[PDB]
């Protein structure tokens, strides 16, 4: 079996700047007879099905952006974006199209890099529908910021939570290149009642101290 | 155009068989070869198996090999793999995609999910929201995935951030989705979170208030 090793498996290039994404192939995939490399190379935006945007090695699909071009030969192949735009933030892969099993590269997640942005921070109490069912979550919401690099911590009552929270972030934004997330702090409706402070601190790159969102129990 | 459309997919116990289909329109189905590739949520492309455009020449990945069969139906515009003796390392979004100089095609994809636990439909409980003010729907404890979740029948599109579900201490899955609107429109304007949990038939549409 022909084994694909992409490099870098994630890259951060900057707004209107060149991506470099590399390709090695285990072994050969020039086909002599029609004197074609059986390269292809695929772009899979979040949430999304996979996108053709080369086959060939070099021959860009119609209707992709002249931005995408494939290189290389034999063994070594070469994926280039130029000018980088937002919605070029996805996870890119190779695959050989030579002999069964057709396999893929294990991809390459493409970030785009724009200016610091800090987060917009919400507080979300539990709903009383949810704490009629015995258990309390509290939200804790981190809009549109960058980079990635995020503090969350959790204070019931001035006491610092661990353990019990949980968090989920977005993918890079198609637009602006942002993140948002969502932290969750669970707990039984019984030791939600125990306590009247519940307070979020936020830590980010983008605000020059820690933001606190908080919400008294019964107000 | 091309559309590729894939279904099938659903909770399997392991051990169990499924069949996938691929309904295929805008196209000369029988002039193309057809392929399935596999992805487990949040990881890489795999790819599973081929047909000719006969069905005469197959092939399939190792890992899948004597457990699967891919099948065409040229008259009836249909891809299938059927799919035996199902394990964990199984789950996975399956695609089907039409072959020309590579893979130029693809479907939106069908997710196979094989597990002994139990299809559970969520609760869904509002964010109530406290310039611009932030509002949404949590969706509570459900297996397996999917849920989606849209605002206002898809009418409210901006500012909209569905979360990527996150598996609880529990082993059910939860995610909230939030809308971030000016503070002036909460009179004025409703805010409705439609969640479709297919898996459980449960479909809730949740008005959000102060
Ligand atoms: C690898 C490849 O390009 N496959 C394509 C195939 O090409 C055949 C087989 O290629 P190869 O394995 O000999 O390298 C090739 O011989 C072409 O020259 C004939 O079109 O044509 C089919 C359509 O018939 C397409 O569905 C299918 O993606
Ligand atoms: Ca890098
Ligand atoms: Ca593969």
């Known amino acids: 079996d022909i084994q694909l090793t992409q490099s870098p498996d994630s890259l951060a290039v900057s707004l209107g700047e060149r991506a470099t994404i590399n390709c090695k192939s285990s072994?050969?995939?020039?086909?002599?007879?029609?004197?074609?490399?059986?390269l292809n190379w695929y772009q899979q935006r979040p949430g999304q099905p996979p996108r053709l945007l080369i086959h060939?090695?070099?021959t860009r699909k119609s209707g992709v952006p002249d931005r995408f071009s494939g290189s290389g030969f034999g063994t070594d192949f070469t994926l280039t974006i130029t000018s980088l735009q937002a919605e070029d933030v996805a996870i890119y892969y190779c695959?050989?199209?030579?002999?069964?099993?057709?396999?893929f590269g294990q991809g390459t997640k493409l970030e785009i890099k724009r200016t610091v942005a800090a987060p917009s921070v919400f507080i979300f109490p539990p709903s009383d529908e949810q704490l009629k069912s015995g258990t309390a979550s509290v939200v804790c919401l981190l809009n549109n910021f960058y980079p990635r690099e995020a503090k969350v911590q959790w204070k019931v009552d001035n006491a610092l939570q661990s353990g019990n929270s949980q968090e989920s972030v977005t993918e890079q934004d198609s637009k602006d290149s942002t993140y948002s997330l969502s932290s969750t702090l669970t707990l039984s409706k019984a030791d939600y009642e125990k306590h009247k402070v519940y307070a979020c601190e936020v830590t980010h790159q983008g605000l020059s101290s820690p933001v606190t969102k908080s919400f008294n129990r019964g107000e | 155009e091309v559309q590729l459309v894939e279904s099938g997919g659903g909770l399997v116990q392991p051990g169990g068989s499924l069949r996938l289909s691929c309904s295929a329109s805008?196209?000369?189905?029988?002039?193309?070869?057809m392929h399935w590739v596999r992805q487990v949520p949040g990881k890489g492309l795999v790819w599973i198996s081929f047909?000719?455009?006969?069905?005469?020449?197959?092939a399939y990945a190792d890992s899948v090999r004597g457990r699967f069969i891919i099948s065409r139906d040229n008259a009836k515009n249909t891809l299938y793999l059927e799919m035996n003796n199902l394990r964990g390392e199984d789950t996975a979004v399956y695609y089907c995609?039409?072959?020309?100089?590579?893979?130029?095609?693809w479907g939106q994809g069908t997710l196979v999910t094989v597990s002994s636990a139990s299809t559970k439909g969520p609760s869904v409980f509002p964010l109530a929201p406290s310039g611009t003010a932030a509002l949404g729907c949590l969706v509570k404890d459900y297996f397996p995935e999917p849920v989606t979740v849209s605002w206002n029948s898809g009418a409210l599109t901006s500012g909209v951030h569905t979360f990527p579900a996150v598996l609880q201490s529990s082993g059910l899955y939860s995610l909230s989705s939030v809308v971030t609107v000016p503070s002036s429109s909460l009179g004025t304007q409703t805010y409705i979170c439609n969640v479709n949990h297919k898996p459980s038939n449960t479909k809730v549409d949740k008005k959000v208030e102060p």
């Open positions: 995609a039409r072959g020309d100089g590579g893979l130029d095609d």
């Open positions: 047909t000719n455009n006969e069905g005469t020449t197959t």
């Open positions: 072994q050969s995939i020039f086909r002599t007879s029609r004197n074609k490399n059986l």
């Open positions: 695959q050989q199209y030579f002999s069964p099993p057709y396999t």
């Open positions: 805008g196209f000369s189905f029988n002039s193309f070869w």
């Open positions: 060939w090695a070099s």
